[PDB]
Amino acid sequence: HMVDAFLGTWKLVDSKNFDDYMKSLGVGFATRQVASMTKPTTIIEKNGDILTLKTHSTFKNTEISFKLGVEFDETTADDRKVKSIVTLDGGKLVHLQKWDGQETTLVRELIDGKLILTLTHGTAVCTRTYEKEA
Numbered sequence: 240h241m242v243d244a245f246l247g248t249w250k251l252v253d254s255k256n257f258d259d260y261m262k263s264l265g266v267g268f269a270t271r272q273v274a275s276m277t278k279p280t281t282i283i284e285k286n287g288d289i290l291t292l293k294t295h296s297t298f299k300n301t302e303i304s305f306k307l308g309v310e311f312d313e314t315t316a317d318d319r320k321v322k323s324i325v326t327l328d329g330g331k332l333v334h335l336q337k338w339d340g341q342e343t344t345l346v347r348e349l350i351d352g353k354l355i356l357t358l359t360h361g362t363a364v365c366t367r368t369y370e371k372e373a
């Protein structure tokens with residue numbers, strides 16, 4: 240399964256344009272100040288057809304579980320209540336969130352052994368680079 244290469248624990252080492260991405264979502268200044276300065280850990284697990292993606296940080300934790308291709312309800316780290324779907328498109332794990340007539344896509348792919356997360360909302364595009372910890 241293509242998901243096997245994503246499994247494990249990943250730690251943020253680099254970020255580009257995250258503040259702009261949060262601004263585009265309406266995250267307030269005080270939260271952006273802290274969120275831009277944290278280095279989250281993302282844990283990706285799979286048991287049968289169910290994938291679980293956990294994001295851990297010193298001040299906020301999220302967890303979602305899903306089957307690929309099946310829409311699910313998600314409450315995001317910034318408290319948006321969204322409709323989500325995740326597909327594995329070739330080698331790219333593509334997570335689409337929809338709410339209030341808006342969308343944002345979170346694409347994860349493996350480049351040179353690192354996990355690259357690209358977040359797009361409107362024209363705000365952010366790249367988050369994660370190194371494999373375990």
Ligand SMILES: CCCCCCCCCCCCCCCC(=O)O
Binds near residue numbers: 281294
């Ligand atoms: C995940 C770090 C703390 C997040 C605090 C809430 C404000 C920003 C949330 C924006 C949507 C989720 C972004 C995830 C980024 C990532 O996984 O590197």
